[PDB]
């Protein structure tokens, strides 16, 4: 009753649906066979082979609960762009002299939409963006004069129309 | 009785001092409450409370302040001397860790900026995400993002690399 009879296995395939299917299968097996969280944690290494086994050897001390073991599998194997990479790319290029504010804001908010969904509110997102705006706009627009991207775009478009 | 600030003894000239701003806001909130002035009327009468730079400032922003609450938030935002968050982020991302900057002084310079943002805005995981891309390849070869959870972990692992090299 520790997964020694379980026919599900995971080798480290970096495929979201494969990871969710595996996690779903072992949660079901655990529930149907009446395995405790503590025993599921002590037996989970029986379900890994290849790269997943080498991986588990490296992280198992971090998994103090069954729930943390499941979170480690999702975090490590479900593929995503690392947040640190998104921030670096966000700060890599300032707004050009001839790039209008709408397309500049679209591209930047597109990078912000790659970060975890609940992490930043619109105020924080505006703070991240505001320093990259062209000096042409910041001469007219105080950070304290805008609360939303829509406020910023409304003032920026007026500036563009008056050139 | 009063419907305006004509009997208020408090005024603000634009001193960029957090304690002065909070004292002024507290004093006009007390007067407003004692005289039973509504939010809407306090906003219509607020210009009497400003002189000098604060008067010129208010002339320039008053259209943005559609409520008393928004007026008070604009005073706090404009007169509390702080580096604005957007400038903190730009300065943070301006310099990568050089080949000769060790982990202690790199982390200290970056924490000096992060400590100027609102205390509850970013948890340590988010602060490490902001930092990690700026770390020199000397550290990133040996230190995986998934392997550090705290600045203490990062400092401990970076010092081992330095002790070896
Ligand atoms: Cl079993
Ligand atoms: Cl006062
Ligand atoms: Cl501060
Ligand atoms: Na302005
Ligand atoms: Na407003």
Swiss-Prot record, chain A:
Keywords: Membrane, RNA-binding, Synapse, Transport. GO terms for molecular function: identical protein binding; mRNA binding; structural molecule activity. GO terms for cellular component: extracellular vesicle; membrane; postsynapse of neuromuscular junction; sarcomere; synapse; virus-like capsid. Induction: Up-regulated following stimulation of E347 brain neurons. It is found in: Extracellular vesicle membrane; Synapse. It comes from the Eukaryota. Expressed in a specific population of brain neurons, named E347, that are necessary and sufficient for proper body fat storage. Disruption phenotype: Strong reduction in the number of synaptic boutons at neuromuscular junction in third-instar larvae. GO terms for biological process: behavioral response to starvation; mRNA transport; muscle system process; regulation of neuronal synaptic plasticity; vesicle-mediated intercellular transport. Master regulator of synaptic plasticity that self-assembles into virion-like capsids that encapsulate RNAs and mediate intercellular RNA transfer from motorneurons to muscles. Arc1 protein is released from motorneurons in extracellular vesicles that mediate the transfer of Arc1 mRNA into muscle cells, where Arc1 mRNA can undergo activity-dependent translation. Intercellular transfer od Arc1 mRNA is required for synaptic plasticity at the neuromuscular junction. Belongs to the ARC/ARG3.1 family. The protein is evolutionarily related to retrotransposon Gag proteins. It contains structural elements found within viral Gag polyproteins originated from the Ty3/gypsy retrotransposon family and retains the ability to form virion-like capsid structures that can mediate mRNA transfer between cells. Tetrapod and fly Arc protein-coding genes originated independently from distinct lineages of Ty3/gypsy retrotransposons. Homooligomer; homooligomerizes into virion-like capsids. This is Activity-regulated cytoskeleton associated protein 1. It comes from Drosophila melanogaster (Fruit fly). The gene is Arc1. The chain holds residues 43 to 205 of 254 of the full protein.
From Swiss-Prot, chain B:
GO terms for biological process: behavioral response to starvation; mRNA transport; muscle system process; regulation of neuronal synaptic plasticity; vesicle-mediated intercellular transport. One of its GO terms (cellular component) is virus-like capsid. Disruption phenotype: Strong reduction in the number of synaptic boutons at neuromuscular junction in third-instar larvae. Expressed in a specific population of brain neurons, named E347, that are necessary and sufficient for proper body fat storage. The keyword Protein biosynthesis does not apply. Keywords: Membrane, RNA-binding, Synapse, Transport. It is found in: Extracellular vesicle membrane; Synapse. Induction: Up-regulated following stimulation of E347 brain neurons. It comes from the Eukaryota. The keyword Oxidoreductase does not apply. Its main location: membrane. GO terms for molecular function: identical protein binding; mRNA binding; structural molecule activity. The protein is evolutionarily related to retrotransposon Gag proteins. It contains structural elements found within viral Gag polyproteins originated from the Ty3/gypsy retrotransposon family and retains the ability to form virion-like capsid structures that can mediate mRNA transfer between cells. Tetrapod and fly Arc protein-coding genes originated independently from distinct lineages of Ty3/gypsy retrotransposons. Master regulator of synaptic plasticity that self-assembles into virion-like capsids that encapsulate RNAs and mediate intercellular RNA transfer from motorneurons to muscles. Arc1 protein is released from motorneurons in extracellular vesicles that mediate the transfer of Arc1 mRNA into muscle cells, where Arc1 mRNA can undergo activity-dependent translation. Intercellular transfer od Arc1 mRNA is required for synaptic plasticity at the neuromuscular junction. Homooligomer; homooligomerizes into virion-like capsids. Belongs to the ARC/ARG3.1 family. This is Activity-regulated cytoskeleton associated protein 1. It comes from Drosophila melanogaster. The gene is Arc1. The chain holds residues 41 to 205 of 254 of the full protein.
């Amino acid at each position: 009753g520790n997964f020694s009879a379980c026919t599900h296995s995971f080798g480290g395939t970096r495929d979201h649906d494969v990871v969710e299917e595996f996690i779903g299968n072992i949660e079901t097996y655990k529930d149907v066979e009446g395995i405790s969280d503590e025993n599921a944690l002590k037996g989970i290494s029986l379900l890994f082979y290849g790269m997943a086994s080498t991986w588990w050897q490296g992280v198992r001390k971090e998994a103090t609960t069954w729930k943390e073991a499941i979170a480690l599998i999702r975090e490590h194997f479900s593929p995503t762009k690392p947040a640190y990479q998104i921030y670096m790319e966000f700060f890599q290029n300032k707004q050009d002299d001839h790039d209008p504010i709408d397309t500049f804001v679209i591209q930047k908010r597109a990078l912000l939409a790659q970060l975890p969904s609940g992490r930043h509110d619109e105020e924080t997102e505006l703070d991240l963006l505001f320093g990259l705006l062209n000096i042409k706009y910041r001469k007219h627009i105080s950070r304290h004069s805008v609360h939303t991207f829509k406020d910023l775009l409304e003032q920026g478009r007026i500036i563009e129309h008056n050139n």
